[PDB]
RNA sequence: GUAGAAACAGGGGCCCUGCUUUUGCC
């Protein structure tokens, strides 16, 4: 049965308009899309049949919505099917579309199907529903599809499906006022060819009875007064930078650092330095290799020190020390050249003091104590509480898991951990969430942004954001995880910037809502004209728009020529010939699974034992075993014409100049 | 293989460009 705000929201789309539905998370936007579907099905003109596609950005959501529509519509005699990457391969997409009244998909499935010629026109659909439609932007699959929709609209020799978009936040982009916010929202509208924005105006009070927007609480807590740990590590980082200058004048390559150790700014300095160092070209190739490798290692070490600093700010000294000791264990197990031995020793020199510092309990993190106090208060007051605790990085989430494991809240509450996809698998993720839902003692969940939206999580009465800031849409989603009766959302930070950030988000949320009500004042003509002008602008922006050797990204040793490379299925870059087999060595893949028609066999590495750089994998494919598949990020390209060296993060530039795989060519190579 | 977001800063005169962090998708 429908609520009145649900009926209200469905009205423009029921009248056949391309509609954008803005309504709060969990308010029942999906139920609204179902009401529109029902109406769609019944009001088809003579001789027409409906074909609905529901698009979802993620597999969990894909699965949830698939089963919603199955349950709602199969009992009414409708055929409801779904395609995701998990079955894309074993089904014909054309056939599924042919046999189905409603099809639910992840959007890339459709993109793949246009690109491979399976589909030619979007006229096969009468209604396209885009869950989380605010993702229609840039090179997102949603926007690839809507670009195709608009290209067809512009060669208007066909009828196009109705568009429906579901979101809880249209966003504001870079808007600083109502006017620029209005521009941003209209842009989104133009990308989706919207004709009406549908919000709750008439039935606001009923909405407010079902939805309870948590009271936020923003707490600024004090940092450590002294951080001896960070003094030490910083000196090591200074030592390491000076050693780096000894090796090669990085002043002639990159700039000198501002020694702002343990900052994002430093993090990005090291990253820029790395790319410059690896693009070093010398006459003497032996020296190029020697220098580049030693700078590779130095920058790697500098990054880990920086990481350890940042970890120590948000967590315990021991968590930061653990991170480094695990790293150095790996150093000791790798090539472990003389330079790596030197660095490990300089560290082990200082390690006794660090172990000492990490054991002092007056050397404890104020911000982490405050976190623990917050949790203790909640579970003391209400032991039924279920908490969702968010933090930015995997390293921080791991640290917080260890904390809450070794120091359980009120000495009984146990944490679960949720990270993205060692990551976690979707089965693992689901396992964790089920425990978090049902368990008596597992009432705390620690998560990265994996938990912001989409995947189904039991409602929480406490949401804690631990130095976890972001944009207005993130804020809106994250609060939607806290809708249990008398829920709180608490932002814990030691940074005024983050407090101001959250102050801005409040402004923008209210700016956004005001911007929408102004747009809703306009008549259809005014709106339609505006959206059209932007589609025309977008269109005019689109109007405007040799042989190389690959070198080990680390030791600069010759790998292969671009002439030896073949592309399989536009994605996978294999290397032909016996010569290349001399250049690498393999180890069994630790996860030897199958995907895209390929079976993973091995990891590939630079054969240079002093390097051992990861180059990719080997696979079984068709009638071929142990095909090497290289990844672009492991290599530096060098032009055979100019001699000059290039870095590339994506194949996209190069692919134009590479031959495609030919099973007949391959067959002759034996 | 590749997409979004956020942070950090090289180019154009507010977009472009990269980078990491993070999540995703095939
Ligand atoms: O360049 C990649 C790519 O060609 C192929 N590949 C690996 N993972 C994926 C994937 O999720 N999706 C697609 N389309 N293609 C993929 O293998 C090449 C090498 O990649 P990696 O070296 O990262 O391979 P793998 O993930 O097995 O290494 P690791 O995860 O064990 O580090
Ligand atoms: N009118 C209704 N009657 C009963 N349950 C409803 C109703 N509207 C929504 N729900 C329930 O609310 C939950 C959230 O709805 P959903 O459409 O997923 O929200 P949204 O897409 O707006 O985030 C679902 O479990 C759904 O069954
Ligand atoms: Cl070698
Ligand atoms: Mg990989
Ligand atoms: Zn190498």
The full set of domain ranges for chain A reads: 4-211, 215-220+365-495, 228-357, 548-667
- Between CA A5 and CA A206 the distance in angstroms is 7
Determine if strand B comes within 7 Å of the CB of A184: no
How open is the CA angle A280-A286-A288, to the nearest 5 degrees? 10
CATH hierarchy code of domain A548-667: 2.170.150.30
State how far the Cα of A432 lies from the Cα of A444, in Å rounded to an integer: 11
- The response to whether residue A617 sits with its C-beta less than 6 Å from ligand 1 reads yes
Scored b (16 or more CB within 10 A) or e, A143-161 reads: bbbbbbbbebeeeeeeebb
User: Would you say the C-alpha torsion A455, A457, A460, A463 has a positive or negative sign?
Assistant: negative
Judge whether residue A304 contacts strand B, using its CB and a 7 Å cut-off.
no
CA distance A486 to A95: 49
Method: X-ray
Distance A451 CA to ligand 4 centre (A): 22
Other Cβ atoms closer than 10 A to A669: 9
CA A82, CA A221: separation in Å to the nearest integer?
48
A132 φ, ψ (degrees, to nearest 5)? 60, 55
Q: Is the dihedral of CA A83, A87, A93, A99 positive or negative?
A: negative
- Alpha-carbon span A471 to A498, nearest angstrom: 11
Question: What CATH code is assigned to A4-211?
Answer: 3.40.50.300
Ligand nearest to the CA of A614: 1
Helix extents (H) in A119-250: 141-154, 178-191, 204-210, 228-247
User: Atom 3, ligand 2: which residue's CA is nearest?
Assistant: A1
CATH fold, domain A228-357, is phosphoenolpyruvate carboxylase, domain 3 (1.20.1320)
Rounded distance in angstroms from the CA atom of residue A480 to the C1' atom of nucleotide B12: 40
Token pair of A412, please? Answer: 């009984």
Expressed in angstroms and rounded, the spacing between residue A584 Cα and the centre of ligand 3 is 9
> Would you state the structure tokens that stand for residue A618, as one six-digit string?
């080997």
Token look-up 């990490």 returns A358
* CA pair distance A626, A261, nearest whole angstrom: 44
A window 505-544: Cβ near strand B (< 7 A): none
Resolution of this model in Å is: 2.0
Is residue A575 within 6 Å of ligand 1 at its C-beta?
no
Distance A337 CA to ligand 5 centre (A): 13
A62 CB contact with strand B at below 7 Å = yes
Instruction: Say which DSSP state A413 is in.
Output: B
* Contact status, residue A647 vs residue A278, Cβ threshold 8 Å: yes
A184 by DSSP, 3-state: which? helix
Does the CB of A239 sit below 7 A from strand B? Answer: no
Other Cβ atoms closer than 10 A to A623: 9
A669, A576 in Cβ contact below 8 A?
yes
Query: How far does Cα A542 stand from its chain's mean position?
Result: 26
Cβ-contact A568, A590 below 8 angstroms: no
Detail the DSSP E strand segments found in A427-511.
444-447, 462-466, 488-493
CA A647 to CA A503: how far, in whole Å? 40
For A514-523, which contacts have Cβ atoms below 8 Å and span 24 or more sequence positions?
A: A514/A178, A514/A181, A515/A172, A515/A175, A515/A178, A515/A181, A515/A182, A515/A185, A516/A22, A516/A170, A516/A185, A516/A197, A516/A199, A517/A199, A518/A178, A518/A182, A519/A182, A519/A185, A519/A186, A519/A197, A520/A197, A520/A199, A520/A201
- Please provide the distance, in angstroms rounded to a whole number, between the alpha carbons at the two ends of chain A: 67
Angle value at C-alpha A652, between A174 and A111, nearest 5 degrees: 75
Give the C-alpha separation, A414 to A400, whole Å.
12
Ligand 1 atom with minimal separation from the A629 CA = 18
Q: In this structure, what DSSP letter does residue A138 have? A: T
**Which residues on adjacent β-strands are paired with residue A417?**
A446
For the beta sheet containing A645-646, the strands, ordered from the edge strand earlier in sequence to the opposite edge, are A558-561, A548-552, A635-639, A645-646
Contact A332, A385 (CB under 8 A): no
Say yes or no: Cβ of A394 under 7 A from any atom of strand B.
yes
Q: Which of A94, A123, A127 is nearest to A109 (CA)?
A: A94
User: What would the two tokens of residue A633 be?
Assistant: 């990020």
State the DSSP code for A425: -
Nearest residue to nucleotide B7, by CA–C1' distance, is A264
Q: CB neighbours (10 Å) of residue A210?
A: 13
| Class of the CATH-defined domain A215-220+365-495 | alpha beta
Q: What whole-number distance in Å separates Cα of residue A168 and Cα of residue A191? A: 17
Q: What is the dihedral of CA A558, A562, A566, A571, to 10 degrees?
A: 90
DSSP designation for A501:
H
A606 within 8 A of A296, measured Cβ to Cβ: no
What's the CA-to-centroid distance between A639 and ligand 1, angstroms? 26
Protein CA at A421 to nucleotide C1' at B24, angstroms: 9
User: Could you check: is the Cβ of residue A140 within 7 Å of any atom of nucleic acid strand B?
Assistant: yes
Radius of gyration in angstroms for the set of CA atoms belonging to chain A, rounded to a whole number: 28
Quick one: which H or E segment has residue A595? strand A594-595
Select from A3, A23, A26 the residue to mutate for testing ligand 2; criterion: most ligand atoms less than 8 Å from CB: A26
- Say if A4-211 and A215-220+365-495 have the same CATH topology: yes
Ligand 1 atom with the shortest distance to the CA of A589: 31
Q: Whole-number Å distance, CA A32 to C1' B7? A: 37
Q: In A334-393, which ranges are continuous DSSP H helix? A: 338-357, 366-381
> Helix H segments across A86-227?
93-99, 107-115, 141-154, 178-191, 204-210
Identify any residues that bridge with A573 across adjacent strands, giving them in sequence order.
A567, A630
CA-based torsion, A111, A113, A116, A120: positive or negative? negative
Element (DSSP H or E) covering residue A605: strand A598-606
């Amino acid at each position: 049965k429908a609520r009145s705000y649900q009926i209200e929201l469905a009205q423009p789309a029921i009248n056949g308009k391309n509609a954008l539905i803005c309504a709060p998370t969990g308010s029942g936007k999906t139920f609204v899309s179902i009401l529109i579907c029902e109406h769609h099905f019944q009001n088809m003109p003579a001789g027409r049949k409906a074909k609905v596609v529901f698009l979802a950005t993620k597999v969990p959501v894909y699965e949830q919505q698939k089963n919603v529509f199955k349950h709602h519509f199969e009992r009414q005699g409708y055929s409801v099917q779904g395609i995701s990457g998990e079955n894309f391969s074993n089904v014909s997409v054309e056939k599924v579309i042919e046999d189905s009244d409603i099809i639910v998909v992840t959007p890339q499935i459709l993109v793949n199907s246009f690109e491979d010629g399976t589909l030619t026109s979007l006229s096969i659909f009468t209604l396209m529903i885009f869950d989380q439609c605010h993702n229609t932007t840039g090179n997102h699959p949603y926007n690839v599809l809507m670009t195709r929709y608009l290209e067809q609209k512009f060669n208007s020799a066909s009828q196009l499906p109705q568009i429906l978009g579901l979101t809880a936040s249209v966003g504001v982009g870079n808007a600083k006022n109502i006017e620029e916010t209005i521009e941003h929202i209209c842009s989104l509208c133009s990308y989706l060819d919207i004709q009406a924005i549908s919000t709750v105006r008439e039935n606001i009070q009923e909405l407010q009875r079902f939805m309870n927007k948590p009271e936020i609480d923003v707490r600024l807590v004090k940092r450590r007064i002294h951080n001896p740990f960070a003094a030490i590590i910083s000196n090591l980082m200074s030592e390491t930078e000076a050693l780096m200058r000894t090796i090669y004048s990085v002043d002639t390559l990159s700039q000198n650092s501002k020694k702002d150790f343990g900052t994002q700014n430093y993090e990005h300095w090291i990253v820029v330095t790395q790319r410059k160092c690896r693009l070093l070209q010398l006459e003497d190739k032996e020296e190029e290799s020697r220098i580049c490798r030693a700078l590779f290692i130095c920058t790697e070490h500098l990054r880990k020190y920086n990481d350890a600093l940042i970890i120590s700010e948000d967590a315990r000294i021991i968590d930061a020390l653990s991170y480094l000791t695990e790293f150095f264990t790996n150093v000791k197990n790798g090539p472990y050249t003389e330079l790596e031995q030197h660095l490990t020793a300089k560290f082990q020199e200082k390690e006794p003091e660090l172990i000492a510092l990490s054991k002092d309990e007056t050397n404890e993190n104020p911000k982490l104590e405050e976190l623990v106090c917050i949790l203790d208060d909640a579970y003391r007051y209400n032991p039924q509480t279920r908490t969702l605790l968010f933090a930015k990085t995997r390293a921080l989430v791991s640290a917080l898991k260890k904390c809450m494991e070794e120091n359980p809240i009120l000495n009984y509450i146990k944490p679960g951990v949720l990270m993205g996809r060692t990551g976690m698998t979707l089965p693992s993720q689901k396992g964790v969430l089920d425990a978090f839902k049902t368990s008596k003692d597992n009432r705390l969940l620690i998560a990265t942004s994996v938990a912001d939206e989409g995947i189904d999580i039991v409602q929480c009465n406490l949401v804690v954001l631990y130095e976890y800031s972001g944009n207005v849409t993130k804020m809106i989603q994250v609060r939607g995880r806290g809708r249990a009766a008398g829920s709180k959302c608490i932002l814990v930070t030691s940074k005024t910037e983050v407090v101001e950030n959250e102050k801005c988000n409040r402004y923008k949320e209210e700016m956004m809502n005001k911007a929408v009500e102004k747009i809703q004042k306009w008549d259809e003509e005014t709106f339609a004209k505006k959206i059209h002008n932007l589609q025309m602008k977008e269109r005019v922006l689109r109007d405007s728009r040799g042989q190389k050797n690959l070198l080990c990204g680390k030791c600069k040793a010759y790998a292969c020529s671009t002439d030896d490379i073949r592309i399989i299925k536009d994605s996978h870059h294999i290397v032909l010939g016996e010569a290349f087999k001399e250049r690498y060595t393999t180890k069994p893949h630790k996860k030897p699974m199958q995907f895209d028609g390929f079976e993973k066999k091995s990891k590939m590495y630079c054969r240079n034992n002093n390097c051992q750089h990861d180059w990719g994998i080997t696979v079984k494919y068709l009638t071929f075993d142990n095909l090497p598949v290289i990844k672009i990020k492991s290599f530096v390209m060098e032009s055979t014409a100019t001699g000059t060296q290039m870095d590339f993060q994506k194949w996209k530039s190069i692919n134009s100049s590479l031959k495609n795989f030919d099973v007949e060519e391959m067959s002759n190579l034996y």
